[PDB]
Amino acid sequence: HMESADLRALAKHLYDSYIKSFPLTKAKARAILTGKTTDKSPFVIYDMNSLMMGEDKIKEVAIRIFQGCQFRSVEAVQEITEYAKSIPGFVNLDLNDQVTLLKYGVHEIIYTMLASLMNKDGVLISEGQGFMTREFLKSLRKPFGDFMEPKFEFAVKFNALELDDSDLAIFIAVIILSGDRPGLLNVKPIEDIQDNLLQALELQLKLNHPESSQLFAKLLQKMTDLRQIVTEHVQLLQVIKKTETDMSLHPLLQEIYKD
Amino acid sequence: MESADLRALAKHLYDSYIKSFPLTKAKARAILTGKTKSPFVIYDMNSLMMGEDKIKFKHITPLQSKEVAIRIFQGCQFRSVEAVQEITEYAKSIPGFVNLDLNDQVTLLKYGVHEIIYTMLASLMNKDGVLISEGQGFMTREFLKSLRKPFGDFMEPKFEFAVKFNALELDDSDLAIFIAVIILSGDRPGLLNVKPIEDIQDNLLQALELQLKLNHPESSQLFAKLLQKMTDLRQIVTEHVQLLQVIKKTETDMSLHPLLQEIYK
Ligand SMILES: O=C(O)c1ccc(-c2nn(C(=O)c3c(Cl)cccc3Cl)c3ccc(Cl)cc23)c(OCc2ccccc2)c1
Ligand SMILES: O=C(O)c1ccc(-c2nn(C(=O)c3c(Cl)cccc3Cl)c3ccc(Cl)cc23)c(OCc2ccccc2)c1
């Protein structure tokens, strides 16, 4: 449908907007995680006392961490929404469909971009100023410990693809413009956009990872991992809500999960 | 891989697909469209009674429950078990498969058959019903969907998937490679040696990509769209398992001869 130079033009547009919309890119996250730098070193939270000193440097503990995750997730939804509006064609769609695409897309994107902040040992927090260990997260009390770990399980697998931000920008766009979301009114204009986004992703991956055979297909197979984990996540929230009333969700998240 | 080798792999898989499965999509479509020998139509109780009397569909004959919705439900189980052997035979023709670790062969088949059965079920389905007994019968969607509370809602999601999947208008040469790709999934739990499985899937994906470009040149990004269907397949298979457990925990008019239970477990 589109010519090669237009596909490169679209990749560059989406990368540029991705940089403008998201505060902490994978490039910066990797520089902090690998280290070698004295200025970008995070403070590491691995236990209670280090959590106590960290809140000085940058309610029950598992709740406080959980609320920390909701708060950043809500911020992520805002950033994702701002990015979505820059995807060519998105704002021109029926307004109910705009809501529907975001409703079902934000969680799959949050998981994707969370991986950029992760390695096998923990996750960056507070715009990269802190690093909270995986083992500490998994050791939180009964419901919450195992609520944290699946995010890491996805991230190590997804990060083995070695995508960079310019790849992720198009991949994220492809997720949003999914015509198979429930309740869409005009699937066809959404698929026309995804077709160009898919063409753009395909060419991008061929040029940026010429040695990574069938990375396109392998990356699309990860969209399978994203559906299931989002589903598990929702089922865990419902269970936690049924026990914890010292918890309450941001109305933005509340609406997303309803029906 | 070179272009002609991918065509060789496509043709190998197409030939094997034809020999392994009883009723192809091409022939199933001829029956459903009404082109073809009209199949016997099961649209209610009395027509089921006459079909099992006149044609004697072997998955739909007495054995143990007299209740019809249970009998149809079990008939789907019985045919699924036949298909497993057909899929298993097809798997052995996939280049490289028999050379894998034997436990991995079992693991891949174990975790793949559900996704493949759903996929191939669509070939026998349209929006109005499903072919049975190698195309000799046609059971209507309305009759299946109207079976009493648990069983009606167990049948309908299969049609809903099939209708969406059939809109891709894949033919048998497409499906043969697609089924192969499902089998060679390296993320199945308990695999011992993932690398040779992904190596094979990589070849199969290349062949599927080229096949779809040549067979559907007008169908932009059909490759990507078909891989996105593997999302639908994963989800529906998980739902299906959750649906069975509820039936097992509620229905106790379901007991068969213990040997039958072992076979059709
Ligand atoms: O910076 C970011 O882009 C971003 C995006 C997502 C999360 C995150 N969300 N999350 C959920 O459970 C969740 C999700 Cl996926 C979606 C909606 C609501 C919720 Cl509540 C997590 C569970 C475990 C972990 Cl390790 C992280 C998350 C995130 O955590 C940073 C964090 C970690 C520890 C303490 C404080 C802050 C950062
Ligand atoms: O000939 C075939 O290729 C083939 C493949 C799959 C099915 C089938 N399986 N099935 C499951 O629930 C199921 C599945 Cl998808 C996967 C694994 C196990 C199970 Cl148990 C069905 C549910 C509803 C319907 Cl309408 C059909 C199926 C099949 O039914 C033929 C049939 C229909 C009605 C009465 C008796 C027999 C034929």
UniProtKB/Swiss-Prot annotation, chain A:
GO molecular function, one term: STAT family protein binding
Lineage: Eukaryota, Metazoa, Chordata, Craniata, Vertebrata
Source organism superkingdom: Eukaryota
Compartments where located: Nucleus; Cytoplasm
UniProt keyword Transcription present: yes
Annotated organism of origin: Homo sapiens (Human)
Effect seen on changing Q70P: In colon cancer; sporadic; somatic mutation; loss of ligand-binding
Residue ranges annotated for the NR LBD domain, each copy included: 6-259
Gene Ontology CC annotations of this record: chromatin; cytosol; intracellular membrane-bounded organelle; nucleoplasm; nucleus; receptor complex; RNA polymerase II transcription regulator complex
Subunit structure: Interacts with FOXO1 (acetylated form). Heterodimer with other nuclear receptors, such as RXRA. The heterodimer with the retinoic acid receptor RXRA is called adipocyte-specific transcription factor ARF6. Interacts with NCOA6 coactivator, leading to a strong increase in transcription of target genes. Interacts with coactivator PPARBP, leading to a mild increase in transcription of target genes. Interacts with NOCA7 in a ligand-inducible manner. Interacts with NCOA1 and NCOA2 LXXLL motifs. Interacts with ASXL1, ASXL2, DNTTIP2, FAM120B, MAP2K1/MEK1, NR0B2, PDPK1, PRDM16, PRMT2 and TGFB1I1.
Protein's name according to its UniProt entry: Peroxisome proliferator-activated receptor gamma
Protein role: Nuclear receptor that binds peroxisome proliferators such as hypolipidemic drugs and fatty acids. Once activated by a ligand, the nuclear receptor binds to DNA specific PPAR response elements (PPRE) and modulates the transcription of its target genes, such as acyl-CoA oxidase. It therefore controls the peroxisomal beta-oxidation pathway of fatty acids. Key regulator of adipocyte differentiation and glucose homeostasis. ARF6 acts as a key regulator of the tissue-specific adipocyte P2 (aP2) enhancer. (Microbial infection) Upon treatment with M.tuberculosis or its lipoprotein LpqH, phosphorylation of MAPK p38 and IL-6 production are modulated, probably via this protein.
Keywords: Activator, Biological rhythms, Cytoplasm, Diabetes mellitus, Disease variant, DNA-binding, Glycoprotein, Isopeptide bond, Metal-binding, Nucleus, Obesity, Phosphoprotein, Receptor, Transcription, Transcription regulation, Ubl conjugation, Zinc, Zinc-finger
Post-translational modification: Phosphorylated in basal conditions and dephosphorylated when treated with the ligand. May be dephosphorylated by PPP5C.
Activity control, per UniProt: PDPK1 activates its transcriptional activity independently of its kinase activity.
Motif 9aaTAD mapped to chain: 251-259
Free-text domain note: The 9aaTAD motif is a transactivation domain present in a large number of yeast and animal transcription factors.
Induction: (Microbial infection) Expression increases when incubated with M.tuberculosis or its lipoprotein LpqH; induction is TLR2-dependent (at protein level).
Interaction with FAM120B as annotated region, ranges: 3-48
Family: Belongs to the nuclear hormone receptor family. NR1 subfamily.
Documented effect of changing R72H: In colon cancer; sporadic; somatic mutation; partial loss of ligand-binding
Cross-link (Glycyl lysine isopeptide (Lys-Gly) (interchain with G-Cter in ubiquitin)): K20
UniProt: rosiglitazone binding residues: Q70, F71, R72, S73, H107, H233, Y257
The keyword Oxidoreductase appears for this protein: no
Broad class of the protein's primary localization: nucleus
GO biological process: BMP signaling pathway; cell differentiation; cell fate commitment; cell maturation; cellular response to hypoxia; cellular response to insulin stimulus; cellular response to low-density lipoprotein particle stimulus; epithelial cell differentiation
Residues of the full protein shown: 235 to 503 of 505
Tissue distribution: Highest expression in adipose tissue. Lower in skeletal muscle, spleen, heart and liver. Also detectable in placenta, lung and ovary.
Disease: Defects in PPARG can lead to type 2 insulin-resistant diabetes and hyptertension. PPARG mutations may be associated with colon cancer.
